[PDB]
């Protein structure tokens, strides 16, 4: 069992490099529009308290340099949508895929194509943490890298990298410029909230372990929602809702283990520990596999 | 903090994946130029798997017995030849999406990206390392035979692995692109035993060197040790022995930092005997042995 990432072929052809003055980052080229973080128009001095309205009116069309590999794209207009910058180009992208803009909720997974100066370098799978941050590997020049999901022929763009929080986590927006979490695109002291474990993803991972034949942690006890939740709050586990039970229903029928039945197994794992054992070869309980991910992997 | 396992972009490989069907058997193929590469056991039924006579099976096949599909477009096989455990199908059409490619054979401990595909359609990509017992860790359900492993350098793609079989312990075995098997395995449905899997010691040391550069230093001690002394202790933890070759490879890492390689070995010895005590190294609660010294040096 491994954390698989979606193939990145349809996204690699949409990545471009956007230069404005002395700042260069990554841009998403779809149809005849290039999307990039709005702070590309800011100098280092302006990052303290920028007024993006006054800086954008001063800027003109020839202040933006957009490059798609070896060719040069001509900007014929600029527009601002929340925290994202929309640049109109003269030539439409012939590699534009079937795509849609969507906003996801914390706990959902997606793949990230990390690009440096318009050149893709790596891809990995991650989940939106409950504090609206992502644990990724973005060095300098990776701003504007996009997160995505693939549904057959349709690519769903759901994230764009904006900032780099000092704790190591990163913060971003959706493709419509709406930020994930209480952050602003300013160079100030910002702190991500307390990170917590996604309980529903752990249960889906535990169900995948039973599918793989590993069922030593199963016991004869079953708990209820309120009793398990009080235990969950103690060790910083996200509260379990009724909607989580129905979402995990298909995994319950296949393995034959009820959601509340498996909940008592997770409760014992948090209380008495692992007892020097392993689950799928891991000494820790993974929480970056959504229930939909588990079904896709095997069933 | 944060040193994530990143995989290479798979775009240049996705256009090379095709579907090969012979009789009732179907797996994945690699379409480079005007040649299609696929495992040779595609000419086998479930009954022939116990004791396959590949020379006898292949002599009875004609060109029209192989069906090759690239998307909705079907390719015409005009010839075929066997090279070790791989089948080379010549086709009338050269692949227009062929990138700059090479064939390289890899050693244990090195890393590559795997593109998992089912019936010629890519499904997911992940990063892995070649274990010292010549197996790989992953999730390849049936129909994924023929998936390739690769590294990308600049614009050149280096193919190094082709998935062939599924060992009964959960690990997977395969060959290089010339059809030569990795490790002591054959394309037979018989009792094949993989050796004990050991931690890649040189990869852990390079990972720990990257930890020192990023500011993590809680595991350092003032002690030093010799190569033979560290090796004797290392075997007790199922750790791969360290050789004089590994010492010079880590030389640039031990040059940027102030820690000698044998000094770093002493710290690793103390970690094994003690544990992490709830701490983390680069955001990881466990020692990582899937980052090569080359990757650490390049990424600094």
Residue B4 is nearest to which of A137, A281, A283, comparing CB atoms? A137
Cα(B43)–Cα(B26) distance, integer angstroms: 10
Nearest Cα neighbor of B139 from B128, B152, B130, B153 is B128
Check residue B41 and give left, alpha or beta (phi > 0: left; psi -120 to 50: alpha).
alpha
Nearest Cα neighbor of A84 from A51, A39, A143, A142 is A39
**Gap from A161 CA to chain B (nearest CA, Å):** 16
Check if the beta carbon of residue B215 is closer than 8 Å to that of residue B156. Answer: no
Check if the beta carbon of residue A61 is closer than 8 Å to that of residue A77. Answer: yes
Strands B101-103 and B156-166: what pairing?
parallel
Contacts of A114 in chain B (CB under 8 A): 6
Strands A154-164 and A98-101: what pairing?
parallel
Question: Directed axis angle between helix B261-274 and helix B201-214, to 10°?
Answer: 100
Check if the beta carbon of residue B187 is closer than 8 Å to that of residue B39. Answer: yes
Q: Which long-range contacts (CB under 8 A, 24 or more apart) does A87-92 make?
A: A87/A18, A87/A27, A87/A33, A87/A34, A87/A35, A87/A36, A88/A32, A88/A33, A89/A29, A89/A32, A89/A33, A89/A34, A90/A32, A91/A32, A92/A31, A92/A32
Cα(B38)–Cα(A215) distance, integer angstroms: 37
Indicate the burial class of B94 (C-beta count within 10 angstroms; 0-12, 13-18, 19 or more): exposed
Quickly tell me which residue has 């764009």 as its tokens.
A160
Contacts of B285 in chain A (CB under 8 A): 283-284
Nearest Cα neighbor of B214 from B274, B281, B133, B260 is B281
Cα(A205)–Cα(B173) distance, integer angstroms: 26
Measured in angstroms, the resolution is 2.4
Nearest Cα neighbor of B200 from B299, B111, B283, B105 is B111
Who contacts A230 (Cβ-Cβ below 8 Å, separation ≥6)? Answer: none
N-to-C CA span, chain B: 14
Q: Does domain B11-91 have CATH number 2.40.10.10?
A: yes
> 3-state DSSP call for residue B283?
coil
Q: Residue B278's CB: how many other CB atoms inside 10 A?
A: 6
> CA A81, A87, A89, A93 torsion: positive or negative?
negative
For A299, name the nearest residue in chain B, comparing CA atoms only.
B141
Indicate the burial class of A194 (C-beta count within 10 angstroms; 0-12, 13-18, 19 or more): exposed
Cα(A170)–Cα(A140) distance, integer angstroms: 12
Question: Directed axis angle between helix A259-272 and helix A225-234, to 10°?
Answer: 30
> 3-state DSSP call for residue B139?
coil
Check if the beta carbon of residue A157 is closer than 8 Å to that of residue A101. Answer: yes
What's the DSSP call for residue B136? B
Q: Is residue A273 within 8 angstroms of chain B, CB to CB? A: no
**May I ask the CATH class of domain B201-299?**
mainly alpha
Check residue A117 and give left, alpha or beta (phi > 0: left; psi -120 to 50: alpha).
left
- Pair of tokens at residue B66: 């192989």
Helix (H) or strand (E) holding B153: strand B148-153
Task: Give, in order, the Cα–Cα distances in Å from A275 to each of A65, A172, B171.
Answer: 58, 39, 25
SS3 readout for chain A = CCCCECCCHHHHCCEEEEEECCEEEEEEEECCEEEEEHHHHCCCHHHCCCCHHHHHHHCCHHHEEEEECCEEECEEEEEEECCEEEEEECCCCCCCCEEEECCCCCCCEEEEEEEECCEEEEEEEEECCCCCCECCCCCCCCCCCEEEEEECCEEEEEEEEEEECCCCCEEEECCCCCECCCCCCCCCCCCCCCCCECHHHHHHHHHHHHHCCCCCCCCCCCCCHHHHHHHHHHCCECCCCHHHHHHCHHHHHHHCCCHHHHHHHHHHHHHHCCCCCCECCECCCCCCCCHHHHHHHCC
Residue B163 β-bridge partners:
B174
Strands B66-70 and A84-89: what pairing?
unpaired
Cα(A250)–Cα(A256) distance, integer angstroms: 10
Q: Is residue A250 within 8 angstroms of chain B, CB to CB? A: no
Residue A238 β-bridge partners:
none
**May I ask the CATH class of domain A199-298?**
mainly alpha
For A296, name the nearest residue in chain B, comparing CA atoms only.
B123
> 3-state DSSP call for residue B181?
strand
Nearest Cα neighbor of A217 from A267, A182, A255 is A267
Q: Residue B99's CB: how many other CB atoms inside 10 A?
A: 15
Contacts of B300 in chain A (CB under 8 A): none
Q: Residue A71's CB: how many other CB atoms inside 10 A?
A: 9
Nearest Cα neighbor of A94 from A37, A35, A10 is A10
Contacts of A281 in chain B (CB under 8 A): 137
* Interface test with chain A among B2, B9, B120, B275, by most A beta carbons within 10 Å: B9
Task: Give, in order, the Cα–Cα distances in Å from A188 to each of A48, A129, A165, B208.
Answer: 7, 22, 10, 32
Check if the beta carbon of residue A224 is closer than 8 Å to that of residue A17. Answer: no
**Gap from A285 CA to chain B (nearest CA, Å):** 12
Check if the beta carbon of residue A15 is closer than 8 Å to that of residue A73. Answer: no
Q: Exposure string (b/e) for B49-86, b if CB count within 10 Å is 16 or more?
A: eeebebeebeeeeeeeebebbbeeeebebeebeeeebb
Quick check: A124 and B3 CB within 8 A?
Answer: no
Quick check: A121 and B283 CB within 8 A?
Answer: no
Residue A2 is nearest to which of B3, B11, B138, comparing CB atoms? B138
- CA geometry: angle A267, B286, B165, nearest 5 deg: 95
Contacts of B8 in chain A (CB under 8 A): 122-123
């Amino acid at each position: 069992f491994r954390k698989m990432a979606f193939p990145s072929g349809k996204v690699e052809g949409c990545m471009v490099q956007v230069t404005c003055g002395t700042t260069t980052l990554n841009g998403l080229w779809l149809d005849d529009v290039v999307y990039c973080p709005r702070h590309v128009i800011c100098t280092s001095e302006d990052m303290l308290n920028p007024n993006y309205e006054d800086l954008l009116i001063r800027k003109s069309n020839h202040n933006f340099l957009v490059q798609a590999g070896n060719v040069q794209l001509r900007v014929i207009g600029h527009s601002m949508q929340n925290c994202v910058l929309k640049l109109k180009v003269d030539t439409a992208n012939p590699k534009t895929p079937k795509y849609k803009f969507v906003r996801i909720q914390p706990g959902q997974t997606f793949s990230v194509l990390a690009c440096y100066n318009g050149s893709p370098s790596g891809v990995y799978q991650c989940a939106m943490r409950p504090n609206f941050t992502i644990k990724g590997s973005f060095l300098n020049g990776s701003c504007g890298s996009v997160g995505f999901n693939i549904d057959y022929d349709c690519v769903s763009f759901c994230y764009m990298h904006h900032m780099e929080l000092p704790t190591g986590v990163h913060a971003g927006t959706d493709l419509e410029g709406n930020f994930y979490g209480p952050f602003v695109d300013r160079q100030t002291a910002q702190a991500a909230g307390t990170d917590t474990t996604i309980t529903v993803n752990v249960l889906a991972w535990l169900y995948a372990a039973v599918i793989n034949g590993d069922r030593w942690f199963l016991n004869r006890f079953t708990t209820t929602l309120n009793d398990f939740n009080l235990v969950a709050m103690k060790y910083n586990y996200e509260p379990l809702t009724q909607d989580h039970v129905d979402i995990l229903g298909p995994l319950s029928a296949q393995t034959g283990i009820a959601v509340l039945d498996m909940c008592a197994s997770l409760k014992e794992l948090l209380q008495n520990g692992m007892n020097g054992r392993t689950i799928l070869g891991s000494a820790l309980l993974e929480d970056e596999f959504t229930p939909f991910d588990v079904v896709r992997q095997c069933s």
